[PDB]
Design a protein around this ligand. Sequence first.
Ligand code: GQJ
Length: 185
Amino acid sequence: HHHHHHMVHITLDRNTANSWLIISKDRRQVRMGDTHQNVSDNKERFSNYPMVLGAQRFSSGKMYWEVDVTQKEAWDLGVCRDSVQRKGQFSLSPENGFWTIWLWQDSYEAGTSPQTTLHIQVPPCQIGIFVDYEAGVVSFYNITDHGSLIYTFSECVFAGPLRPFFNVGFNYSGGNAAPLKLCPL
Ligand SMILES: COC(=O)[C@@H]1C[C@@H](O)CN1C(=O)c1ccco1
């Protein structure tokens, strides 16, 4: 792809994080802690899952960023509406305001309803995410495999400002402690 020139500098919003997450000083990395991280509760925090939003809000234009997923067993990545539900149980779908892909149990899937199987020959260590607000497109790229396309959501109905979306996943296995990292431009 040739989307690299739309690169944006994403930082994580500490106030939206699940209370078990640990965000680095530079706000560019996030991992699952082994306990509650001693923060107060607020209406922004994702309560049920290890999720956090980017600070940046997008309502126009073309945006591109990259995320490092090295050695993780499970994660979700993409964008979501600013007004997504924070509390309780929900599914990641465009009807609920999410445009996402994930890794789970050794398979990659796009967060459609129902979910769509992805076809990845080279397990990615870094993911590229491209949003074209006006066109209604969210695309995912395999940086490890020379930028090959993973998935395109088209005909997106954003219906609001968008935020970068992250889920570091649970670590029930002891094999999913590694962080998500925003990669340098
Ligand atoms: C890009 O490849 C990966 O991230 C793979 C996917 C999954 O099989 C876990 N994994 C590891 O490499 C890993 C987990 C713990 C130590 O290494």
